[PDB]
Amino acid sequence: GSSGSSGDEETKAFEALLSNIVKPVASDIQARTVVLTWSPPSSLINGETDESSVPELYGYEVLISSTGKDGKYKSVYVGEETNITLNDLKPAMDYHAKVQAEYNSIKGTPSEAEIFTTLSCEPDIPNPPRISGPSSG
């Protein structure tokens, strides 16, 4: 049932909205597994449209370049959820990551890169980078 153009106006808003998210943050980083948490894109519709309308299934894809941000990116996971755990990674390594949004067959631009270092197969890291409030000096 291919007719042709289907309300392009919508496609545009998606090209910008889907590309209006924030770089994924790395937490509870482990040997090869890690906790990647990212927030949804910000709608610039200006409220012109209802609030309980915008979709929340923005297919987010996690990209990583064990080599570097100036090389090739590989897919590790792909879903709608916001928080996901990575796997099949390399311990004692340092690479960048990014999350791209895609909805209605519309692939937008990924967010900034998030460099995160993983621990070694064995229990080395003493404690996580977690910060417990500010500290004088």
Curated annotation (Swiss-Prot):
It comes from Homo sapiens. The chain holds residues 256 to 379 of 1198 of the full protein. Belongs to the FNDC3 family. This is Fibronectin type-III domain-containing protein 3A. Residues 20-121 form the Fibronectin type-III domain. It is found in: Golgi apparatus membrane. It comes from the Eukaryota. Coiled coil: none annotated. Expressed in the odontoblast and nerves in the dental pulp. Also expressed in trachea and to a lesser extent in the brain, liver, lung and kidney. Mediates spermatid-Sertoli adhesion during spermatogenesis.
